[PDB]
Amino acid sequence: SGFRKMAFPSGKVEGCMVQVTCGTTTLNGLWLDDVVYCPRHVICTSEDMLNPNYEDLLIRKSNHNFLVQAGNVQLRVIGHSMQNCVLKLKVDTANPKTPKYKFVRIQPGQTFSVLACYNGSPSGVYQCAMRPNFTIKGSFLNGSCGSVGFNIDYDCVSFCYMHHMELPTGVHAGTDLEGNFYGPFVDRQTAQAAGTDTTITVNVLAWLYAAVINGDRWFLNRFTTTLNDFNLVAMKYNYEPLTQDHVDILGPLSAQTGIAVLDMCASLKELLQNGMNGRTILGSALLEDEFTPFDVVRQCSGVTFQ
Amino acid sequence: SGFRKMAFPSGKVEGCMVQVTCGTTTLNGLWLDDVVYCPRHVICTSEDMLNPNYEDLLIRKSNHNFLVQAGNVQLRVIGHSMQNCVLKLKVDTANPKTPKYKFVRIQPGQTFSVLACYNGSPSGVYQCAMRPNFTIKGSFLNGSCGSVGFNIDYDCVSFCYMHHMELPTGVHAGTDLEGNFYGPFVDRQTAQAAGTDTTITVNVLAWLYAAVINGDRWFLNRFTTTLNDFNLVAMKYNYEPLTQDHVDILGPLSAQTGIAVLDMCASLKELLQNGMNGRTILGSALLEDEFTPFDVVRQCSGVTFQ
Ligand SMILES: *[C@H](O)[C@H](C[C@@H]1CCNC1=O)NC(=O)[C@@H]1[C@@H]2[C@H](CN1C(=O)N(c1ccc(Cl)cc1)c1ccc(Cl)cc1)C2(C)C
Ligand SMILES: *[C@H](O)[C@H](C[C@@H]1CCNC1=O)NC(=O)[C@@H]1[C@@H]2[C@H](CN1C(=O)N(c1ccc(Cl)cc1)c1ccc(Cl)cc1)C2(C)C
């Protein structure tokens, strides 16, 4: 037993991480087969970053301007192209450590692991959720751009995020691996703002089930509620609406604990209207929303990755 | 910016993890050079685990009873010996993925990363602290024994923990890699209890500094206090005494923020006596104590590992 915010083992992604330097900008790239992917704002100077025309900036670049550094081995760049907000640097060596992989785009409310990197060297791994407002609450310092987010399915790495920038509230924005931003953000050094967030209701319910599985039961009650009457309460506390598909997805956790989904909704309703009154749930004094139903089932059942 | 509970990249440890099966018990082993380390209770049956005499049990074993499984390659065991509560299985192949490593024993209050494993396959990575009562609050299911805890220093893996058991409160107990238990626990299926815990005061102060660095300032005050008068408050709220060495260790964080350590103590005193009054610190509604001063400096500065 126990419940921890758990990242995927990072070894398969560590073997893909390289350093990309152009001019005075150094960031991280992702090396898969003979392509290195990295944020296109590597081609910018300090005054380029204010309102850049990236097509103009890129035509003025040469293959030899891009220094790609894989550990202590230099990778010769033999082609370059831009795809949306990422650069694809074609190199003369295929990465012998390339795992089986996919480029997937995730939905708000879904989670992934982030391998934070600096100078092509991995620094730490941690779990993130895509917020409803398409930001992530990460841990990123200067030089972290090009660090990626991912999930692992059995032996396959599904890359879903590449890091590009920090917003004024200290949250983070980036792209999928096709270079398309999550949310209404642009890779320009201009004033942008996250936009209002909401709490991921289905994830909070999943975490309440994790708690019950682990022996925290004090928030349970005999009461029940209808889905419509729960969603009236959710709206008022800035929670996302709960759909019948969310109820369906929570089915297995409901069956394992013997607590009906709508009964757990009644419990959540009381927690929202009363607070916790000095008690904790799974070591937290807040309702936690960055665990999906899948994350709960995985951890409270023990799936591995080969 | 941002602050996350961050684990070390796990790739170097992933390459050491193997499956050890003996009789009807399967658990994980750690393969370094030509030795596989694993909990000695792998040699036990169901009724052996109640009050085992491990010396007697081990003399009745043969090398061929131990099935060691490294991915899809079987490792032939050519010797076995017991060291305290771990078994050392000498195998006929040195692990070509053996990183540079050390066996270190950590202190309560220190943190490490855990690579949770099942059937020799890594499942997830997360950060733990050694509690003052020598337990850890982990996430461990059946078959997780032999999963290890570690820190990484530059290129060197310092292994500090091997997992052995869960206690009745749902916390976890294990050994260092010399097989010596952390705390007063034994690898017997008998009733044992954690013993009273305390909060790691120096770590809470480090986390308050992390918060300030990241722009949470509402808990700051003009007040100050003496070290002796702070420790009178710490005792009452079941916090560990703060020593002058703790004050010294917090020096760099104090200098970076411009907030004197004893001033931050006055802030902590007020938080203990008043609570938080509906506000949060770094996304938590509780005072968090599983970040060391080192963890804060590392993350709020950006050290990597090659
Ligand atoms: C790439 O390594 C870096 C990652 C940043 C650095 C700190 N945390 C991060 O996530 N990305 C950037 O520096 C991008 C890049 C230029 C500006 N930028 C950025 O993150 N910041 C920024 C955005 C808009 C404005 Cl008006 C000013 C700065 C930024 C915000 C906050 C902080 Cl503390 C640092 C940098 C591009 C081209 C947008
Ligand atoms: C090894 O894979 C396993 C890891 C356990 C399993 C669930 N969580 C864990 O950390 N370790 C054990 O099963 C050890 C092993 C026998 C008993 N044991 C153990 O963890 N449990 C236990 C300890 C004492 C008593 Cl009286 C009864 C059980 C245990 C506690 C709680 C739960 Cl939910 C499962 C198992 C050894 C030889 C102590």
XYZ file of C-alpha atoms and ligand atoms in Angstrom:
688
model
C 0.000 0.000 0.000
C 0.845 3.719 -0.049
C 0.197 6.359 -2.709
C 2.861 8.560 -4.216
C 3.006 10.879 -7.145
C 5.027 8.537 -9.323
C 6.877 9.143 -12.583
C 7.708 6.591 -15.250
C 11.263 5.204 -15.219
C 13.191 7.652 -17.351
C 16.014 5.551 -18.777
C 14.512 5.225 -22.264
C 14.178 9.001 -22.557
C 17.588 9.729 -20.980
C 19.253 7.991 -23.920
C 17.617 10.432 -26.342
C 18.659 13.700 -24.746
C 21.263 15.904 -26.437
C 22.545 19.470 -26.204
C 21.743 21.920 -29.021
C 23.683 25.189 -29.217
C 23.190 27.918 -31.806
C 24.796 31.308 -31.371
C 24.581 32.105 -27.658
C 21.518 29.923 -26.973
C 21.961 26.446 -25.500
C 18.973 24.144 -24.941
C 18.031 20.462 -25.100
C 17.114 18.351 -28.076
C 15.431 14.971 -28.456
C 17.410 12.565 -30.673
C 15.326 9.834 -32.325
C 16.709 7.913 -35.292
C 18.649 10.533 -37.305
C 16.620 13.624 -36.279
C 17.093 15.972 -33.327
C 13.934 17.848 -32.302
C 14.230 21.118 -30.393
C 12.328 24.390 -29.831
C 12.662 26.684 -32.820
C 13.490 29.664 -30.587
C 17.055 28.297 -30.426
C 17.667 30.253 -33.647
C 16.868 33.583 -31.939
C 19.184 36.137 -30.376
C 18.137 38.301 -27.414
C 16.548 40.938 -29.650
C 15.295 38.258 -32.064
C 13.056 36.842 -29.316
C 10.915 39.999 -28.994
C 8.914 39.606 -32.247
C 10.680 37.029 -34.423
C 9.908 36.091 -38.009
C 11.142 32.522 -37.755
C 10.994 31.765 -41.490
C 13.264 34.737 -42.151
C 15.540 33.810 -39.266
C 15.857 30.192 -40.386
C 16.725 30.853 -44.042
C 19.755 32.814 -42.764
C 21.034 29.770 -40.846
C 23.493 27.115 -41.995
C 23.759 23.467 -40.932
C 27.140 24.305 -39.360
C 25.571 26.921 -37.066
C 23.872 24.114 -35.075
C 26.207 22.423 -32.586
C 24.644 19.128 -31.453
C 26.404 17.490 -28.559
C 25.494 13.933 -27.486
C 27.432 13.339 -24.309
C 31.012 13.918 -25.429
C 30.353 13.098 -29.101
C 29.542 15.837 -31.596
C 26.739 15.157 -34.081
C 27.188 16.694 -37.526
C 23.983 18.353 -38.711
C 23.274 17.590 -42.376
C 19.866 19.210 -42.803
C 17.426 21.416 -40.971
C 13.755 22.238 -41.326
C 11.018 23.801 -39.304
C 7.788 22.104 -38.319
C 5.411 24.502 -36.582
C 7.249 25.576 -33.417
C 9.945 22.861 -33.409
C 13.097 22.487 -35.451
C 14.079 19.148 -36.994
C 17.846 18.847 -37.364
C 18.755 15.927 -39.490
C 22.029 14.389 -38.312
C 24.431 11.922 -39.897
C 24.056 9.333 -37.094
C 20.952 7.433 -36.035
C 20.560 7.220 -32.241
C 21.334 3.563 -31.388
C 19.339 4.061 -28.173
C 16.116 5.063 -29.971
C 13.242 3.356 -28.121
C 10.048 2.375 -29.789
C 8.053 5.600 -29.685
C 5.000 7.585 -30.705
C 4.175 11.283 -30.919
C 0.802 11.705 -29.217
C -1.080 14.818 -28.155
C -2.734 14.614 -24.754
C -5.949 16.126 -23.377
C -6.219 18.503 -20.426
C -6.684 16.416 -17.313
C -4.152 13.783 -18.448
C -0.810 13.221 -16.733
C 2.728 12.610 -17.921
C 6.285 12.420 -16.648
C 8.781 15.211 -17.326
C 12.535 14.562 -17.588
C 13.987 17.951 -16.713
C 17.298 18.510 -18.516
C 20.072 21.098 -18.740
C 22.907 21.085 -21.304
C 21.568 17.783 -22.647
C 22.027 16.159 -19.218
C 18.992 14.817 -17.305
C 18.496 16.463 -13.902
C 15.278 14.997 -12.423
C 11.970 13.335 -13.224
C 8.510 14.239 -11.967
C 4.839 13.883 -12.783
C 2.710 16.717 -14.315
C -0.901 17.098 -15.424
C -2.050 19.123 -18.449
C -4.218 21.766 -16.759
C -7.647 22.601 -18.228
C -6.095 25.906 -19.325
C -3.333 24.026 -21.242
C -0.510 25.037 -18.899
C 1.495 22.714 -16.695
C 2.787 23.398 -13.175
C 6.378 22.339 -13.737
C 9.835 22.923 -12.361
C 11.934 24.585 -15.057
C 14.950 26.919 -14.931
C 16.892 28.667 -17.673
C 18.208 26.143 -20.156
C 15.428 23.606 -19.583
C 13.753 24.190 -22.955
C 13.566 21.077 -25.055
C 12.996 18.870 -22.011
C 10.168 16.469 -22.878
C 7.087 14.975 -21.248
C 6.073 11.392 -21.891
C 4.165 8.254 -20.890
C 5.364 4.676 -21.287
C 3.096 1.922 -22.586
C 4.614 -1.492 -22.023
C 7.829 -0.870 -24.033
C 6.763 2.197 -26.081
C 7.477 5.840 -25.210
C 4.621 8.193 -26.138
C 6.122 11.676 -26.201
C 3.478 14.306 -25.568
C 5.229 17.539 -24.531
C 8.257 19.633 -25.309
C 9.035 22.572 -23.037
C 9.236 26.127 -24.458
C 8.500 28.856 -21.924
C 7.355 30.113 -18.548
C 4.343 32.418 -18.139
C 4.083 35.328 -15.670
C 2.287 33.244 -13.005
C 5.198 30.807 -12.953
C 3.420 28.036 -14.881
C 4.796 26.528 -18.045
C 3.802 26.241 -21.668
C 4.998 24.076 -24.517
C 4.129 22.078 -27.584
C 3.379 18.567 -28.661
C 6.213 16.882 -30.572
C 4.709 18.072 -33.862
C 5.509 21.611 -32.656
C 1.900 22.675 -32.015
C 1.399 24.624 -28.804
C -0.848 23.426 -26.062
C -3.248 26.324 -25.556
C -3.218 29.881 -26.873
C 0.493 30.608 -26.339
C 3.184 31.647 -28.824
C 6.975 31.350 -28.694
C 7.496 35.101 -28.471
C 8.966 37.082 -25.570
C 5.721 39.027 -25.127
C 3.181 39.383 -22.343
C 0.858 36.378 -22.316
C -1.374 35.069 -19.567
C -2.606 31.610 -18.621
C -6.279 32.216 -18.397
C -8.575 30.880 -15.721
C -8.089 27.278 -14.577
C -10.524 24.744 -13.093
C -10.126 21.617 -10.958
C -10.155 18.234 -12.691
C -13.194 16.646 -11.014
C -12.818 13.083 -12.310
C -9.217 13.047 -11.044
C -10.216 14.199 -7.557
C -12.745 11.357 -7.435
C -10.057 8.902 -8.567
C -7.794 10.118 -5.762
C -10.589 9.723 -3.216
C -10.827 6.089 -4.364
C -7.034 5.755 -3.991
C -7.483 7.026 -0.429
C -10.197 4.494 0.393
C -8.087 1.679 -1.065
C -5.303 2.808 1.269
C -7.551 2.978 4.354
C -8.558 6.663 4.562
C -12.346 6.459 5.036
C -13.322 9.382 7.264
C -14.852 11.418 4.398
C -17.289 8.651 3.444
C -20.991 8.953 4.132
C -24.297 7.164 3.655
C -25.591 10.102 1.606
C -25.929 10.036 -2.159
C -26.675 12.559 -4.895
C -27.688 12.755 -8.528
C -25.193 13.585 -11.253
C -27.083 16.799 -12.050
C -27.171 17.923 -8.423
C -23.467 17.163 -8.015
C -22.628 19.231 -11.095
C -24.495 22.218 -9.643
C -22.074 22.050 -6.704
C -19.050 21.448 -8.976
C -19.818 24.610 -10.975
C -19.919 26.747 -7.833
C -16.502 25.573 -6.608
C -14.916 25.943 -10.062
C -14.776 22.199 -10.708
C -15.178 20.736 -14.173
C -18.528 19.130 -14.989
C -18.643 15.390 -14.399
C -19.915 13.422 -17.394
C -21.415 9.957 -17.670
C -18.188 8.893 -19.372
C -16.263 9.987 -16.261
C -18.685 7.905 -14.187
C -18.028 4.955 -16.509
C -14.243 5.376 -16.307
C -14.477 5.277 -12.507
C -16.448 2.002 -12.661
C -13.555 -0.350 -11.836
C -12.482 1.728 -8.828
C -16.111 1.855 -7.701
C -16.363 -1.935 -7.970
C -13.092 -2.579 -6.123
C -14.083 -0.390 -3.151
C -17.826 -1.084 -3.196
C -18.529 2.664 -3.150
C -20.872 3.871 -5.888
C -19.474 6.711 -8.004
C -22.426 8.940 -7.133
C -21.889 8.129 -3.447
C -18.295 9.306 -3.755
C -19.702 12.434 -5.429
C -21.823 13.057 -2.331
C -18.621 12.733 -0.276
C -16.838 15.232 -2.516
C -19.819 17.596 -2.238
C -19.480 17.568 1.560
C -15.714 18.113 1.382
C -16.261 21.112 -0.894
C -18.925 22.660 1.353
C -17.257 21.861 4.703
C -13.568 21.582 4.028
C -11.544 18.931 5.810
C -11.705 20.241 9.408
C -8.069 19.624 10.288
C -7.789 16.149 8.740
C -5.796 14.897 5.777
C -6.353 12.535 2.855
C -3.340 10.557 1.598
C -1.045 13.037 3.331
C -2.679 16.113 1.746
C -4.814 18.870 3.266
C -6.141 19.774 -0.209
C -8.253 17.896 -2.734
C -5.677 16.582 -5.216
C -6.502 16.551 -8.938
C -3.350 15.435 -10.807
C -3.975 11.655 -10.598
C -6.053 10.099 -13.352
C -8.204 6.992 -12.843
C -5.471 5.177 -14.787
C -2.724 6.466 -12.464
C -4.690 5.207 -9.437
C -5.348 1.764 -10.934
C -1.695 1.451 -12.069
C -0.227 2.321 -8.690
C -2.853 0.601 -6.572
C -2.292 -2.575 -8.800
C 1.393 -2.627 -9.872
C 1.867 -2.465 -13.655
C 5.497 -2.395 -14.901
C 7.308 -1.565 -18.156
C 9.886 -3.622 -20.055
C 10.724 28.629 -11.450
C 8.348 26.092 -9.880
C 8.962 23.478 -7.186
C 8.206 19.805 -7.573
C 9.039 16.730 -5.616
C 11.660 15.491 -8.046
C 13.389 12.123 -8.340
C 16.779 11.418 -9.864
C 16.785 10.058 -13.429
C 16.527 6.320 -12.955
C 18.245 4.917 -16.038
C 21.460 3.921 -14.252
C 19.503 1.914 -11.684
C 17.087 0.418 -14.249
C 20.013 -1.386 -15.866
C 20.785 -3.161 -12.586
C 17.369 -4.596 -11.825
C 16.765 -8.345 -12.121
C 14.165 -10.894 -11.045
C 15.048 -13.405 -8.308
C 12.807 -16.443 -7.813
C 13.278 -19.155 -5.202
C 10.555 -21.683 -4.528
C 7.270 -19.779 -4.766
C 8.738 -16.366 -3.868
C 9.584 -13.883 -6.620
C 11.203 -10.525 -5.821
C 13.739 -8.073 -7.244
C 17.498 -8.154 -7.089
C 20.190 -5.553 -7.711
C 22.888 -6.757 -10.137
C 26.261 -5.020 -9.765
C 29.381 -6.574 -11.269
C 28.926 -10.340 -10.730
C 26.746 -10.183 -7.576
C 22.964 -9.978 -7.244
C 21.765 -8.492 -3.943
C 18.274 -9.295 -2.680
C 16.314 -9.587 0.593
C 17.166 -12.797 2.404
C 13.481 -13.572 3.008
C 13.371 -14.871 -0.584
C 14.542 -18.202 0.867
C 11.416 -18.505 3.055
C 8.166 -20.337 2.420
C 4.829 -19.119 3.810
C 5.330 -20.916 7.127
C 9.072 -20.157 7.070
C 8.308 -16.424 7.302
C 6.655 -16.653 10.748
C 9.843 -17.176 12.822
C 12.661 -18.135 10.448
C 16.154 -19.298 11.333
C 17.814 -17.962 8.205
C 21.174 -19.683 8.751
C 19.394 -23.034 8.925
C 17.216 -22.182 5.943
C 20.171 -21.088 3.815
C 22.392 -24.133 4.403
C 19.554 -26.242 2.936
C 19.610 -24.229 -0.309
C 21.528 -24.952 -3.505
C 22.832 -22.515 -6.127
C 20.360 -24.055 -8.601
C 17.384 -23.164 -6.383
C 17.914 -19.454 -7.213
C 16.485 -18.462 -10.601
C 17.935 -15.080 -11.622
C 16.292 -13.533 -14.632
C 17.798 -10.436 -16.297
C 15.274 -9.388 -18.892
C 14.982 -12.505 -21.037
C 18.445 -13.850 -20.149
C 18.910 -16.321 -17.310
C 21.859 -15.754 -14.971
C 23.490 -18.895 -13.590
C 24.131 -18.576 -9.859
C 27.566 -19.917 -8.901
C 27.693 -19.005 -5.217
C 25.514 -17.647 -2.463
C 26.123 -16.105 0.933
C 24.249 -14.110 3.488
C 25.232 -10.680 4.733
C 22.998 -9.520 7.575
C 19.507 -9.318 6.051
C 20.517 -9.463 2.364
C 21.603 -12.358 0.199
C 24.564 -12.063 -2.174
C 24.182 -14.373 -5.163
C 27.358 -14.605 -7.094
C 26.634 -15.036 -10.803
C 28.788 -16.084 -13.741
C 28.264 -12.801 -15.652
C 29.284 -9.294 -14.642
C 26.581 -6.693 -15.363
C 27.937 -4.679 -18.331
C 25.615 -1.846 -17.260
C 27.125 -1.526 -13.761
C 27.369 2.210 -13.001
C 29.958 3.658 -10.732
C 28.399 3.176 -7.307
C 28.684 3.327 -3.539
C 26.823 1.700 -0.659
C 26.021 4.501 1.784
C 23.767 4.580 4.829
C 21.645 7.697 5.178
C 20.405 9.623 8.223
C 16.775 10.256 9.144
C 15.732 13.506 7.527
C 17.610 12.736 4.285
C 15.874 12.059 0.975
C 16.357 9.568 -1.829
C 14.690 8.299 -4.978
C 12.981 4.901 -5.082
C 12.725 2.850 -8.293
C 9.699 0.676 -7.605
C 10.006 -2.675 -9.394
C 8.006 -5.861 -9.939
C 9.349 -9.071 -11.522
C 12.657 -7.289 -12.135
C 10.887 -4.653 -14.262
C 10.901 -0.981 -13.176
C 7.411 0.450 -12.621
C 7.874 4.042 -11.366
C 10.229 6.439 -9.618
C 9.501 8.767 -6.717
C 11.168 10.669 -3.911
C 11.131 9.507 -0.229
C 12.569 10.802 3.037
C 13.944 8.603 5.837
C 11.552 9.479 8.675
C 12.955 10.208 12.155
C 11.473 6.848 13.183
C 13.450 5.072 10.395
C 10.408 4.230 8.270
C 9.650 5.590 4.828
C 6.242 6.539 3.409
C 6.499 4.629 0.150
C 4.313 3.064 -2.488
C 4.921 -0.687 -2.479
C 2.749 -3.673 -3.444
C 3.376 -7.402 -3.252
C 6.500 -8.304 -5.176
C 8.201 -4.935 -4.679
C 10.823 -6.250 -2.247
C 14.342 -5.708 -3.454
C 13.448 -2.372 -5.046
C 16.188 0.098 -4.091
C 16.520 3.712 -2.992
C 19.385 5.867 -4.187
C 20.922 9.292 -4.819
C 23.096 10.267 -7.771
C 26.253 12.335 -7.355
C 27.519 13.600 -10.681
C 27.970 10.150 -12.311
C 27.951 7.920 -9.186
C 24.943 6.047 -7.779
C 24.893 5.937 -3.966
C 22.521 3.126 -3.038
C 21.057 3.666 0.408
C 17.932 1.493 0.735
C 16.596 -1.907 -0.168
C 12.916 -2.606 0.441
C 11.839 -5.485 2.733
C 8.423 -5.010 4.321
C 5.331 -2.999 5.150
C 4.317 -2.197 8.739
C 0.736 -2.143 10.083
C 0.336 1.635 9.598
C 1.098 1.239 5.899
C 4.639 2.650 6.078
C 7.664 0.761 4.872
C 10.847 -0.641 6.322
C 14.064 -1.881 4.789
C 17.813 -2.106 4.997
C 20.911 -0.406 3.744
C 22.750 -2.328 1.015
C 24.908 -4.022 3.656
C 21.684 -5.690 4.856
C 21.367 -3.725 8.112
C 17.845 -2.569 8.897
C 16.957 1.048 9.266
C 15.375 1.222 12.713
C 14.255 -1.494 15.113
C 12.574 -3.788 12.563
C 13.259 -7.431 11.697
C 12.483 -9.461 8.573
C 9.951 -11.660 10.347
C 6.205 -11.884 9.707
C 5.431 -10.729 13.253
C 3.648 -7.749 14.761
C 5.947 -4.725 14.757
C 5.117 -1.054 15.048
C 6.736 2.108 13.718
C 7.028 4.110 16.851
C 6.285 7.791 17.193
C 7.449 10.120 14.410
C 8.371 13.821 14.428
C 8.509 16.535 11.761
C 11.871 17.346 10.185
C 12.215 21.014 11.184
C 15.258 21.939 9.086
C 13.494 20.557 5.995
C 10.348 22.603 6.623
C 12.523 25.719 6.853
C 14.256 24.762 3.595
C 10.862 24.418 1.914
C 9.768 27.814 3.228
C 12.878 29.232 1.525
C 11.937 27.366 -1.679
C 8.538 29.065 -1.421
C 10.031 32.538 -1.030
C 12.361 31.928 -3.980
C 9.263 31.041 -6.003
C 7.295 34.124 -4.902
C 5.158 32.865 -1.988
C 5.767 35.521 0.693
C 2.526 35.853 2.652
C 3.858 33.970 5.715
C 6.794 36.352 6.173
C 6.918 38.810 9.037
C 9.099 41.468 10.631
C 9.210 39.442 13.854
C 12.222 37.445 14.965
C 12.986 34.909 17.683
C 15.892 33.252 19.437
C 16.930 29.695 18.654
C 16.048 28.621 22.204
C 12.604 30.221 22.083
C 11.911 28.658 18.684
C 12.855 25.214 19.995
C 10.373 25.584 22.861
C 7.667 25.972 20.205
C 9.094 23.139 18.057
C 8.914 20.708 20.998
C 5.242 21.482 21.602
C 4.232 20.799 17.987
C 6.311 17.601 17.803
C 9.015 19.150 15.625
C 12.645 18.122 15.884
C 14.988 20.506 17.701
C 16.797 22.939 15.430
C 20.564 22.982 15.948
C 23.185 25.581 15.110
C 24.404 23.214 12.398
C 20.923 23.320 10.832
C 21.118 27.121 10.969
C 24.520 26.939 9.261
C 23.261 24.569 6.551
C 20.450 27.018 5.775
C 22.970 29.869 5.383
C 23.091 29.896 1.566
C 19.293 29.921 1.264
C 19.167 32.691 3.865
C 21.696 34.723 1.872
C 19.924 34.211 -1.463
C 16.552 35.389 -0.102
C 17.845 37.974 2.375
C 15.726 36.403 5.130
C 17.639 35.528 8.296
C 17.254 31.907 9.406
C 15.915 32.988 12.795
C 13.443 35.292 11.029
C 12.168 32.327 9.036
C 11.902 30.489 12.371
C 9.624 33.261 13.640
C 7.515 32.741 10.499
C 7.343 28.999 11.140
C 6.387 29.673 14.771
C 3.406 31.740 13.597
C 2.369 29.089 11.065
C 2.449 26.449 13.803
C 0.395 28.542 16.241
C -2.080 29.964 13.692
C -2.224 27.508 10.848
C -2.466 28.784 7.296
C -5.981 30.310 7.348
C -7.107 28.991 3.976
C -3.902 29.776 2.064
C -1.323 27.500 0.487
C 2.464 27.371 0.204
C 3.934 25.889 -2.991
C 0.602 24.209 -3.693
C 0.350 22.589 -0.236
C -1.987 23.282 2.684
C 0.444 21.526 5.062
C 3.985 22.302 6.169
C 6.100 19.995 3.994
C 9.168 18.296 5.489
C 10.563 15.903 2.844
C 12.803 18.437 1.031
C 16.320 18.882 2.356
C 18.270 22.145 2.047
C 20.236 20.333 -0.674
C 17.060 19.376 -2.571
C 15.927 23.027 -2.521
C 19.285 24.386 -3.705
C 19.523 21.696 -6.433
C 16.072 22.356 -7.844
C 16.062 26.110 -7.345
C 19.550 26.162 -9.135
C 19.576 23.351 -11.748
C 22.282 20.735 -11.123
C 22.382 17.786 -13.579
C 23.982 14.324 -13.712
C 26.093 12.764 -16.467
C 14.163 27.871 -22.417
O 15.279 27.212 -21.802
C 13.418 28.805 -21.472
C 12.766 28.031 -20.315
C 12.256 29.042 -19.290
C 13.392 29.664 -18.489
C 12.884 29.738 -17.048
N 11.750 28.833 -17.013
C 11.398 28.410 -18.230
O 10.491 27.634 -18.466
N 12.385 29.490 -22.234
C 12.398 30.810 -22.402
O 13.275 31.529 -21.934
C 11.278 31.448 -23.188
C 11.842 31.864 -24.551
C 11.880 33.389 -24.574
C 11.231 33.881 -23.291
N 10.933 32.686 -22.489
C 10.447 32.615 -21.228
O 10.282 31.530 -20.692
N 10.163 33.683 -20.475
C 9.489 34.830 -20.900
C 8.328 34.768 -21.676
C 7.722 35.975 -22.047
C 8.260 37.190 -21.625
Cl 7.526 38.776 -22.059
C 9.406 37.226 -20.851
C 10.018 36.046 -20.491
C 10.488 33.636 -19.110
C 9.475 33.824 -18.177
C 9.763 33.779 -16.819
C 11.063 33.543 -16.397
Cl 11.422 33.478 -14.635
C 12.081 33.353 -17.328
C 11.794 33.395 -18.690
C 10.918 32.636 -25.496
C 11.343 32.825 -26.957
C 9.436 32.870 -25.193
C 8.116 -8.158 -0.504
O 7.786 -8.105 -1.899
C 6.998 -7.655 0.400
C 6.718 -6.162 0.168
C 5.439 -5.793 0.919
C 4.196 -6.331 0.225
C 3.157 -5.212 0.319
N 3.927 -4.026 0.646
C 5.195 -4.310 0.953
O 6.045 -3.490 1.247
N 7.407 -7.858 1.782
C 6.745 -8.677 2.594
O 5.757 -9.312 2.236
C 7.220 -8.818 4.021
C 7.892 -10.188 4.156
C 6.990 -11.046 5.037
C 5.855 -10.161 5.525
N 6.019 -8.863 4.856
C 5.201 -7.786 4.890
O 5.475 -6.785 4.246
N 4.047 -7.745 5.564
C 3.840 -8.211 6.864
C 4.736 -7.944 7.904
C 4.436 -8.452 9.174
C 3.264 -9.178 9.382
Cl 2.815 -9.851 10.991
C 2.389 -9.423 8.339
C 2.680 -8.940 7.082
C 2.953 -7.103 4.964
C 2.350 -6.045 5.634
C 1.268 -5.387 5.065
C 0.791 -5.786 3.825
Cl -0.606 -4.920 3.094
C 1.392 -6.845 3.149
C 2.479 -7.505 3.716
C 8.366 -10.613 5.548
C 9.282 -11.836 5.678
C 8.326 -9.673 6.755
